[PDB]
Amino acid sequence: TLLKNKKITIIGAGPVGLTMARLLQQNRVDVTVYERDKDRDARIFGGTLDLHRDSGQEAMKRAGLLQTYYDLALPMGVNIADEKGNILTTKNVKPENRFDNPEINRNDLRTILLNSLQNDTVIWDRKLVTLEPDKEKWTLTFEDKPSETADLVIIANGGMSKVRKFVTDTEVEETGTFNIQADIHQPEVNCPGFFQLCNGNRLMAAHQGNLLFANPNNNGALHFGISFKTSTLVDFQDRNSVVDFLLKKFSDWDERYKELIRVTSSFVGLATRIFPLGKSWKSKRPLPITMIGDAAHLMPPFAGQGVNSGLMDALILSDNLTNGKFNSIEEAIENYEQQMFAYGREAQAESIINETEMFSSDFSF
Ligand SMILES: Cc1cc2nc3c(=O)[nH]c(=O)nc-3n(C[C@H](O)[C@H](O)[C@H](O)COP(=O)(O)OP(=O)(O)OC[C@H]3O[C@@H](n4cnc5c(N)ncnc54)[C@H](O)[C@@H]3O)c2cc1C
C-alpha cells in the first residue's frame, strides 16, 4: 500500500543494491536498478565476500537465497604466517562453524541476485551523472543515455558516490592506509611456493607494518592484497614501478612472497577511506531518497566489516517500506536511518580501531 504505483529506482547493482531490489520486488514493488557496468558479463574485481549469520545470511534468507548462497559458497580455513614463511597457527573450520562464514565469489553473488530478479529489472550501461528533484518526481541523468524518473531514489552505488548531496554534505576521507591488490590465475603454476603455503586456506601475514592477505581459491584464481600505512614514485599502469616498490618493502620477506610479487601481472592500488557517520543526515529533502551500503557508511575492511552492514540496510529499509508500520515513506526512511546510524557507528568505530591495531608496530595477530 505504502509504495502503491510508486516507481522505485536503485542506483548501483552491487551486492547491497541488488539485495535491496529483490527484497522490494518480492513485495510487488516496481523497482529498477541502474548500473554503470556495460553488461552483466562484466567481471567484478576483488576478493571473496563472507556473509554473517545475523545480517548478510538473514538478508539472503528473507530473499529466499540462503540455500543458494550455501550451495555456491565455500568454507575456508585461515593460516597465519610470518615473513620467513612459517605457519604460526592454522585456524580450521569445525563442522559447527562450517556454514558460519563461507566465502563466495563476487560474480557468483551478483548472478544469484540477478537470477532472483525479474528479467530486465537491472538496466546495464547506465552511469548516473546527476539527480535533480521535480515537484513530484526525481529526474535521473545518465551519461550519453536517456533520462529516467522515479518516486523514490535509493543511493547504493558505493563508497565513492557523487550523488549524495541531497542526503548529506558529508565527504569521504582517507584513514591513512593503502591497499595494492591483484589476481594470479593458475597460482599452482605461477606462484607454487606461496600457493602451497596457503595450502587451501586463506593466509595472513604481518611484518613491519606491512600486511598481506590472500585467498588461494577465488574461482580458480588466487587473489591477494598488500596493505601498509600511507606516507608518488608508483604508476599502477607500469607493473615495474609497483614490483620495485613492493620488493623494497618486502626485502625482509621469504622468497616465496617475492615470487608472488614478481609473477603478478596487473596491480590495483586503492587508498583506504571512510564515509563517516558522525553528523546526522539532512532533515528536509525535496523528495523521498536515502542511501544504503558503502554509499551510506564506507569503512576500512581489515576487520571484516563491510557488505554485511549494507545487507542489514537493505533488510531494514525494505521491511520498513513494506511492513505497513509507517504512515509515510519518509517516516519509514527516518526509522531505517536511525537504526543504521546506531549499529553503523559501532561498525565504523570497530573498523577504525582495528585498522590502527593491525598496522601498529607491535601487531602479531
Ligand atoms: C580491499 C578491500 C577488501 C574488502 N574485503 C571485504 C571483505 O572481506 N568482506 C566484506 O564484507 N567487505 C569487504 N570489503 C568491503 C565490501 O566490498 C563493500 O562493503 C561492499 O562491496 C559494499 O557493497 P555496495 O553494493 O554497497 O557497493 P559496491 O560493492 O561498491 O557496489 C556499487 C555498485 O554501483 C555501481 N556504480 C558506481 N557508480 C555508479 C553510477 N554512477 N551509476 C550507476 N551505478 C554505479 C558500481 O559499478 C557497483 O556495481 C572490502 C573492501 C576493500 C576495498
Numbering used by the authors: 23 to 253, 260 to 393
Describing publication, verbatim:
Furthermore, we describe in detail Tet(X7), a tetracycline-resistance enzyme recovered from a human gut metagenome that confers resistance to tigecycline, omadacycline, and eravacycline. Based on sequence homology to these soil-derived enzymes, we identified an additional enzyme, Tet(56), as a previously uncharacterized tetracycline resistance determinant in Legionella longbeachae. These enzymes are structurally and functionally homologous to Tet(X)12, the flavin-dependent monooxygenase (FMO) originally discovered in Bacteroides fragilis. The emergence of Tet(X)29, Tet(X3)14, Tet(X4), and now Tet(X7) in clinical pathogens now establishes covalent inactivation of tetracycline antibiotics as a bona fide clinical resistance mechanism. We show that the monohydroxylated product of Tet(X) and Tet(X7) reaction with tigecycline coelute, indicating that the site of hydroxylation by Tet(X7) is also C11a.
